[PDB]
Amino acid sequence: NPEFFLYDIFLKFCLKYIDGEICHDLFLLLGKYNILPYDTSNDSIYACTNIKHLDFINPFGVAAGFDKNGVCIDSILKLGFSFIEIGTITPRGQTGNAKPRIFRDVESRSIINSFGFNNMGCDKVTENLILFRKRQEEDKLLSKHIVGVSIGKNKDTVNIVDDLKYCINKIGRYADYIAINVSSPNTPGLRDNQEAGKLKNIILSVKEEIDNLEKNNIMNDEFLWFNTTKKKPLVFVKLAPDLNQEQKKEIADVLLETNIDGMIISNTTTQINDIKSFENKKGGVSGAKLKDISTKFICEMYNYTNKQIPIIASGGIFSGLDALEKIEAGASVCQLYSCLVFNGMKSAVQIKRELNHLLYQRGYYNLKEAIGRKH
Numbered sequence: 001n002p003e004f005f006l007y008d009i010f011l012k013f014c015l016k017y018i019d020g021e022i023c024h025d026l027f028l029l030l031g032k033y034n035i036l037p038y039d040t041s042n043d044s045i046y047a048c049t050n051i052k053h054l055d056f057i058n059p060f061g062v063a064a065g066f067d068k069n070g071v072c073i074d075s076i077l078k079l080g081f082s083f084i085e086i087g088t089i090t091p092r093g094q095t096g097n098a099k100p101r102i103f104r105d106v107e108s109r110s111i112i113n114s115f116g117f118n119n120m121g122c123d124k125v126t127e128n129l130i131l132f133r134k135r136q137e138e139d140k141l142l143s144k145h146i147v148g149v150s151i152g153k154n155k156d157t158v159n160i161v162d163d164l165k166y167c168i169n170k171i172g173r174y175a176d177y178i179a180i181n182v183s184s185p186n187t188p189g190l191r192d193n194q195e196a197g198k199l200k201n202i203i204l205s206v207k208e209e210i211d212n213l214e215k216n217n218i219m220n221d222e223f224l225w226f227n228t229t230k231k232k233p234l235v236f237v238k239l240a241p242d243l244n245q246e247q248k249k250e251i252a253d254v255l256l257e258t259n260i261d262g263m264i265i266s267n268t269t270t271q272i273n274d275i276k277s278f279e280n281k282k283g284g285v286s287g288a289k290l291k292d293i294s295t296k297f298i299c300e301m302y303n304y305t306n307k308q309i310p311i312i313a314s315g316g317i318f319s320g321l322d323a324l325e326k327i328e329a330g331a332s333v334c335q336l337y338s339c340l341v342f343n344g345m346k347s348a349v350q351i352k353r354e355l356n357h358l359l360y361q362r363g364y365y366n367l368k369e370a371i372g373r374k375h
């Protein structure tokens with residue numbers, strides 16, 4: 001397969017010599033120009049999955065922070081992913097923290113970043129997503145692919161809820177689901193919104209603004225929800241792994257009380273302090289070193305919520321084996337980020353095949369039968 005082969009060489013070269021932020025922006029640009037490879041294969045019917053009435057053609061998507069501004073949605077999806085989470089976006093554009101702000105360690109397959117929500121802002125990203133949605137209805141390869149939107153707050157915003165409401169009113173119509181980001185480590189005081197009291201008020205406000213989209217509209221649903229589901233976006237919350245047991249219990253109760261549609265487990269961590277090349281660096285850590293921590297977090301929340309809240313897995317997923325660990329722990333779907341950095345354009349094709357072979361040799365009829373089996 002020549003196209004993937006050439007890109008693997010170029011990506012390995014880029015890893016060794018070129019700055020990480022430069023690399024990421026380079027490949028986003030190549031995707032914008034539509035010169036990345038395609039995965040046009042039919043996905044196994046036995047690896048499809050869902051979160052409530054939200055259907056995924058396969059269980060692998062791209063996590064938030066990868067295409068922050070929705071400039072590259074088509075090409076990333078056509079690598080073989082069933083969905084992508086754009087953002088995190090904020091109402092106003094931000095430059096983020098000072099460069100350099102992302103570093104990679106190849107041997108440990110780990111990353112550390114201190115971006116601080118650099119993004120073009122809700123208005124510009126909304127225009128980008130609208131353009132995608134128009135392209136989607138004329139491209140055979142984009143049908144049934146899901147696009148979620150991660151939302152957060154500007155660095156100097158004091159009322160997070162005011163920022164979340166603004167983003168929902170601008171972009172909610174074009175999103176299949178909304179991810180509430182209260183777990184970034186690179187914006188001071190954001191994670192404090194995971195406290196049960198603050199979190200509950202945030203979720204209810206978010207759900208209220210989404211419900212208010214449908215009200216005061218004269219068109220049929222088919223023209224209000226310009227997304228993939230043609231329904232109002234589901235609501236997820238992304239949690240950080242840096243919490244004590246009691247905090248995790250209180251959060252679990254809030255999710256059940258508010259009837260949230262799902263939880264993303266998890267964001268980056270600050271606990272990792274054994275990566276030599278990162279010892280002087282600032283930010284949250286991604287990649288392999290995060291896998292075990294995040295998989296445990298999945299098991300815990302699956303228990304604390306009594307299996308009632310669907311889970312989106314994020315953290316150190318590189319192989320089909322890694323994916324099955326997340327699924328057997330309680331996850332319904334998996335998100336990749338670091339895998340794309342170190343494995344390149346073949347990440348989706350490769351990991352989908354590995355998971356299919358593993359579901360068979362493990363004696364599963366389909367993916368859904370494996371959800372939560374470890375417990």
Ligand SMILES: Cc1cc2nc3c(=O)[nH]c(=O)nc-3n(C[C@H](O)[C@H](O)[C@H](O)COP(=O)(O)O)c2cc1C
Pocket residue numbers: 063064065066068087088102111112113115117150181184238266267268285286287288290314315316317335336337338339
């Ligand atoms: C450079 C970078 C930027 C990220 N930006 C976001 C973001 O904007 N919003 C978010 O919810 N998570 C963000 N993340 C976290 C990832 O979405 C993901 O949850 C985390 O990296 C763990 O996945 P992984 O181990 O497969 O990389 C970012 C991660 C990295 C490395």
Ligand SMILES: Cc1cc(Nc2ccc3ccccc3c2)[n+]2[nH]c[nH+]c2n1
Pocket residue numbers: 011012014015019020021023024025027028031036072076102104340341344345
């Ligand atoms: C070599 C490399 C790539 C990369 N980012 C990638 C990888 C894969 C992509 C596929 C499609 C579109 C954009 C992509 C961006 N990063 N990121 C942070 N360091 C780093 N190093």
Ligand SMILES: O=C(O)c1cc(=O)[nH]c(=O)[nH]1
Pocket residue numbers: 065088113114115116117118181183184185186267268284285
């Ligand atoms: O924008 C960032 O710096 C960022 C956000 C986030 O949610 N997670 C992360 O690791 N970095």
